[PDB]
């Protein structure tokens, strides 16, 4: 029905190549974000967005790099539309490369609709708020920092830490209507093989849309990799009404692919070299989440970002801390003690904890015991800070229990093991036991109306 049938022009009039930007000339009415199809003199096909136009010029940027592009022989071949990904329901079980193409010797997708990869922002009037609590099984994520279906929440980790080992875990045991779209930006060969051969185990490959983009792939393809991973998931949800779980590997490594392309554009550096719009371009790929009114579907994001040099004040955990709806912190001192999900619960908060708990949802003492299990954790963490200075014997009887809980909190409430899921009822019945090595009247965050039932057991 509605389409464009004019033949595309083919310019052989490149004028300026400096870095990844190819400045064209004698272009007739260029649009702002057209895909152009470069044809190299040695028969290589490269693609590229138009970065900005001015009059007759058109400064495109090439995706696969600019090495080999001539001035006379290369034939940039325009296309009069924006980047439209070919999206279908049969992109579920296939492994795609960085830009759009299949890896596992399959065919190109037939794609009953073509969607804009930039998407459109959802109307906040008809954007319903996530209430349905999802079950992860990890007691640090399920019980203490409970996440709802539709919530965006990252995993704060560093290099060497097993973020990708526990992200496949919540990809494995989350809870017939559950789809998973995976994006791997800047992974190793091992991590791309560890994720490929993990969904080959559980039979979950019938609902997995793995987007691999390895470290040898070009650095501009890492920009459009989490764009296509979401507008795929904005088609499996919001148009086909099934619950999608988006996981973006190395959202840190997306941002160095955002810093590098912006230094080539020579524009407005923010903190630490990252560009000035680095809050916005991490928000257009994070705010595609949540549930809407007239659809049964949902889309929930668990991105992974490696904060450099363990600093939470680095701009990569900083700007995602402002735009997501919480964070999950993976600690390195707990990984050194062979604690399994090496997560620490003090800087890891979930914003949607207040709605997903209650008598209607889950077990009314759960919302209040997490206020108290932070208090026994936060006071006891200062006790080990005090134990380093004065001595192990100058502690009083109050702050010997704060060390006694803190030693038993790490090994019993956490470290489930890599193949054990335990429900929220098992989390609280192993979490109330840790508050029963405490005496009465020091649980000051708990009211007396709720403390009377669960303490005698």
């Amino acid at each position: 029905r509605n389409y464009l049938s004019q033949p595309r022009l083919t310019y052989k009039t490149v004028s300026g190549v400096n870095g990844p930007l190819v400045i064209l000339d004698h272009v007739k009415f260029p649009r702002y974000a057209e895909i152009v199809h470069l044809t190299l003199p040695d028969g290589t096909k490269r693609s590229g967005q138009v970065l900005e136009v001015s009059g007759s010029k058109a400064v495109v940027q090439v995706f696969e790099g600019t090495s080999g592009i001539d001035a006379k022989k290369t034939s940039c071949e325009f296309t009069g539309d924006i980047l439209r990904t070919p999206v279908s329901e049969d992109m579920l079980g296939r492994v795609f490369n960085g830009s759009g193409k299949p890896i596992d010797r399959g065919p190109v997708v037939l794609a009953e609709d073509f969607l804009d990869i930039m998407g459109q922002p959802i109307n906040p009037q008809c954007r319903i708020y996530p209430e349905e609590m999802i079950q992860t099984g990890i007691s640090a994520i399920d019980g203490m920092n409970s996440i709802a279906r539709g919530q965006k929440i990252p995993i704060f980790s560093a290099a060497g830490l097993p973020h990708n080992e526990i992200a496949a875990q919540i990809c494995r045991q989350a809870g017939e209507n559950f789809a998973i779209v995976f994006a791997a930006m800047g992974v190793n060969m091992e991590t791309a093989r560890f994720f490929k051969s993990d969904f080959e185990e559980n039979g979950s490959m019938d609902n997995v849309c793995l987007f691999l983009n390895l470290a040898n792939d070009p650095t501009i393809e890492r920009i459009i990799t989490p764009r296509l991973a979401l507008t795929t998931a904005e088609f499996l949800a919001y148009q086909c009404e099934k619950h999608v779980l988006v996981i973006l590997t190395d959202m840190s490594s997306y941002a160095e692919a955002l810093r590098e392309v912006s230094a080539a554009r020579e524009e407005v550096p923010g903190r630490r070299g990252f560009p000035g719009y680095m809050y916005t371009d991490l928000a257009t790929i994070y705010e595609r989440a949540g549930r809407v009114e007239g659809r049964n579907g949902s889309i929930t994001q668990i991105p992974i970002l490696t904060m450099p040099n363990d600093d939470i004040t680095h701009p990569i955990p900083d700007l995602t801390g402002y735009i997501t709806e919480g964070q999950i912190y993976v600690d390195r001192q707990l990984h050194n003690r062979q604690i399994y999900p090496p997560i620490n619960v003090l800087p890891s908060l979930s914003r949607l904890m207040k709605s997903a708990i209650g008598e209607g949802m889950t077990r009314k003492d759960h919302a209040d015991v997490s206020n108290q299990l932070y208090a026994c954790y936060a006071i006891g963490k200062d006790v080990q800070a005090m134990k380093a200075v004065v001595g192990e014997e100058a502690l009083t009887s109050d702050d010997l229990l704060y060390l006694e809980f803190l030693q038993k909190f790490e090994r019993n409430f956490i470290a489930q093991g890599p193949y054990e899921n335990r429900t929220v009822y098992e989390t609280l019945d192993i979490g109330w036991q840790l508050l029963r090595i405490f005496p009465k009247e020091m649980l000051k965050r708990i009211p007396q109306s709720t403390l009377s039932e669960f303490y005698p057991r």
């Binding site: 550096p269 903190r271 630490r272 380093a388 200075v389 004065v390 001595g391």
Partner: protein, 49 residues
């Protein structure tokens, strides 16, 4: 003469080993992670110019 010399040393070794452990764990890692902040704040103005 040694019994009153024994217990006066354990009152002066404890108020000295705290001042060792106050410098080692409080004063120096407050200065050290301040000095790591002056270095990056120098760098965020050296790329601003």
């Amino acid at each position: 003469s040694l019994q009153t010399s024994f217990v006066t040393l354990d009152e002066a070794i404890k108020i000295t080993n705290r001042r060792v452990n106050a410098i080692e764990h409080v004063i120096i890692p407050r200065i050290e992670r301040t000095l790591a902040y002056i270095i990056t704040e120098l760098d965020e103005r050296e790329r601003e110019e």
